[PDB]
Design a protein around this ligand. Structure first.
Ligand code: 97Y
Ligand code: OLC
Ligand code: OLC
Ligand code: OLA
Length: 423
């Protein structure tokens, strides 16, 4: 039947946005509700949920306006449609920062963590403790003799030093020290069981302490090491502050303790980077949605601008979303090259945040951007194509599932809260 087909597609579309709206409001309430879920990764998700929540609000407002000059001729409809088109562009640009974040998350490691904390030295320097240092935190000997320190470094580099050591030689010696740090942990009875239980992010935090202090030095933190192995991060965070290490070097310790408490790299992230993501997700859509809205009002104003078939005014809202999808597929392909490399080299386990986040992001990129790339320059079997209405309505539900309800961290918070109710 023709009327029955048009009515049935309306139901799966409206229940699609009803299930997506409720799931995204519940999902966003979970990420805001639990304090341990307050990290840059989940804040990026909250802006992405907000763009799908406002899109749903436009769909429910358009439908509510059907009940009582027709609505197609009104100015209110054109605004609801302009706001809807702003939400669609935000969905794809918050999906771009979602990919851009993931890619930088795969790029940050212990070597980049220590290069920030230890810094770089070109020439030999006698530090406050009496130890001669050079490169990226490479301590030589406490022996007060620059002549013998240069000779001690000469055997540890290959050729004659003179004093100045190049950027490549320092990185060569840096890989040695980081390899010497991990061999020490695994060669220690009190550090191997806690390191093997820690995730890749909290492992780098343990290596960082060993790099500065030493294998036998950090092994003394018997009180902190046990509550780390027992996954009690918040209890270990306040206990590590009550240390000699925290009062000696406080700016470095606060960063390492945050990485143990959260299991993220946020204490090494710059505050302007997140301000650049909000400028992409909510800023860039405004730069092409409002010129589209102005040209449609002045040169193609006919039935809430639904008659979008006359000039280049279609391309100004379809070329920027194609650009966000082409770059999202370039990230998609490159992220897969990095993830399969880190898994094969045993640099990553599938239980780590970078893999599980990749497992959801790499799903949503071809889920939202494949249609846009395939039918890239098509302006305008009718029942079979009307199945696009089912996926654009349930989009929000899928985002809420893959970035919240199947997330392992949120499931920890529900069980941790339920256990506190009993105890
Ligand atoms: C809609 C579906 C049927 C498809 C979805 C499914 N997609 C998926 C599954 C696996 C790989 N994959 C494996 N290896 C590689 C490689 F090659 F190494 F990159 C990629 N890629 C894509 C999925 C399943 C599980 C999760 C998941 O638990 N999320 C929670 C993690 C989090 O948010 O913190 C997410 C997505 C489910
Ligand atoms: C308990 C809450 C239940 C109510 C249901 C929620 C309704 C959904 C709408 C908006 C919230 C999502 C948008 C706000 C989150 C983004 C915050 C932000 O802009 O920046 C990140 C952070 O604040 C910098 O550190
Ligand atoms: C039945 C088991 C159900 C759920 C656990 C599996 C959930 C994880 C889903 C990922 C499955 C997958 O497709 O990844 C394997 C990949 O091919 C290789 O890296
Ligand atoms: C319209 C529904 C209301 C939704 C809230 C508005 C969104 C602004 C974000 C803040 C949510 C308020 C909950 C507090 C969590 C923030 C944590 C904090 O920094 O204190």
């Amino acid at each position: 039947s023709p009327e029955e087909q048009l009515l049935f597609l309306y139901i799966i579309y409206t229940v699609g946005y009803a299930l997506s709206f409720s799931a995204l409001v519940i999902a966003s309430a979970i990420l805001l509700g639990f304090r341990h879920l307050h990290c840059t990764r989940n804040y990026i998700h909250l802006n992405l949920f907000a763009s799908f929540i406002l899109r749903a609000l436009c769909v429910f407002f358009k439908d509510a306006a059907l009940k009582w000059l027709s609505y197609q001729d009104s100015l209110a409809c054109r605004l609801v449609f302009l706001l809807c088109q702003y939400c669609v562009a935000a969905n794809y640009y918050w999906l771009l920062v979602e990919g851009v974040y993931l890619y930088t998350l795969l790029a940050f490691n212990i070597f980049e963590m220590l290069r920030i904390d230890e810094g770089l030295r070109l020439k030999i320097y006698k530090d406050t403790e009496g130890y001669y240092t050079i490169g990226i935190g490479h301590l030589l000997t406490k022996s007060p003799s620059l002549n013998a320190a240069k000779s001690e470094l000469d055997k540890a580099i290959g050729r004659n030093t003179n004093g100045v050591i190049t950027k490549d030689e320092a990185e060569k010696l840096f890989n040695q020290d980081v390899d010497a740090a991990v061999r020490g942990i695994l060669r220690n009875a009190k550090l191997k069981p806690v390191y093997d239980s820690l995730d890749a992010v909290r492992r780098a935090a343990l290596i960082n302490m060993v790099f500065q202090m030493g294998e036998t030095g950090v092994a003394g933190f018997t009180n902190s090491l046990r509550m780390l192995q027992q996954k009690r991060w918040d209890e270990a965070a306040v206990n590590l502050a009550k240390s000699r290490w925290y009062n000696q070097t406080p700016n470095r310790a606060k960063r390492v303790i945050t990485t143990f408490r959260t299991g993220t790299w946020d204490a090494y992230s710059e505050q302007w980077i997140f301000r650049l993501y909000v400028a992409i997700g909510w800023g860039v859509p405004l730069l092409f949605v409002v010129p589209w809205g102005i040209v449609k009002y002045l040169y193609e104003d006919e039935g809430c601008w639904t008659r979008n078939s006359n000039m280049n005014y279609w391309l100004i809202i379809r070329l920027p979303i194609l650009f966000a999808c082409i770059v999202n597929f370039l990230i998609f392909v490159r992220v897969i090259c990095i993830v399969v490399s880190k898994l094969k080299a045993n640099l990553m386990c599938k239980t780590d945040i970078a893999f599980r986040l990749a497992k959801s992001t790499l799903t949503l990129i071809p889920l939202l951007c494949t249609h846009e790339v395939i039918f890239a320059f098509v302006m305008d079997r009718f029942i079979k194509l009307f199945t696009e209405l089912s996926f654009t309505s349930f989009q929000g539900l899928m985002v809420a599932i893959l970035y919240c309800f199947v997330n392992n961290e949120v499931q920890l918070e529900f069980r941790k809260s339920w256990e506190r109710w009993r105890l």
